């Protein structure tokens, strides 16, 4: 549960990402798979690559990271009301995907990483105490739903 000023930060801060939302999606799928590989064995369509600058050099990546990211605001727009939105997700995730809740942590985490990467000095403590109180919530929340379904 986040107050009024702390979405405010969240917005404010989702502005940066949506000025290029494929650069911002790039690096924070490059961040995850580089520091967490056995993430990449989740995607049948990007377990191929196997060097950073294969991942660099993809649209596909690219592409997916616009889509994710474009979700995650999506989400992160609706203040905490996104029952609607995350609901596929959360079911999606584990139920096809099979995507353990803690590499929701390490994207999470990627997330905070990128930020500052792309705007060092831009990124202030009270944005990134916003910043990751939101995406504990969402996480929170796709617990929640994983537990419902007995996901491990
Ligand atoms: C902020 C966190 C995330 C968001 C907003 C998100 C969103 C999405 C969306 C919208 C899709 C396409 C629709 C669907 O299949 O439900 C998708 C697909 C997928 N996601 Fe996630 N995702 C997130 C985190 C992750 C993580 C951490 C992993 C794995 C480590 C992952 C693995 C996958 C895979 C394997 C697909 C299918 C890709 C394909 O074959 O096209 N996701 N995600």
Same mark, same amino acid.
């Given at each position: 549960g986040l107050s009024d000023g702390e979405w405010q930060q969240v917005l404010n801060v989702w502005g940066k990402v949506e000025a290029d939302i494929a650069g911002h999606g790039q690096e924070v799928l490059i961040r995850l798979f580089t520091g967490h590989? /056995?993430?990449? /064995?989740?995607?049948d369509k990007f377990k191929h690559l196997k060097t950073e600058a294969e991942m660099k050099a993809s649209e596909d990546l690219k592409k997916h990271g616009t889509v994710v990211l474009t979700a995650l605001g999506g989400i992160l727009k609706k203040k905490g009301h996104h029952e609607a939105e995350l609901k596929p997700l959360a079911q999606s995730h584990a139920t096809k995907h099979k995507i353990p809740i803690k590499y929701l942590e390490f994207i999470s985490d990627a997330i905070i990483h990128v930020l500052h990467s792309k705007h060092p000095g831009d990124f202030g403590a009270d944005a990134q105490g916003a910043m990751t109180k939101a995406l504990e919530l969402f996480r929170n929340d796709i617990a929640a739903k994983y537990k419902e379904l007995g996901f491990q």
């Open positions: 590989p /056995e993430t990449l /064995e989740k995607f």
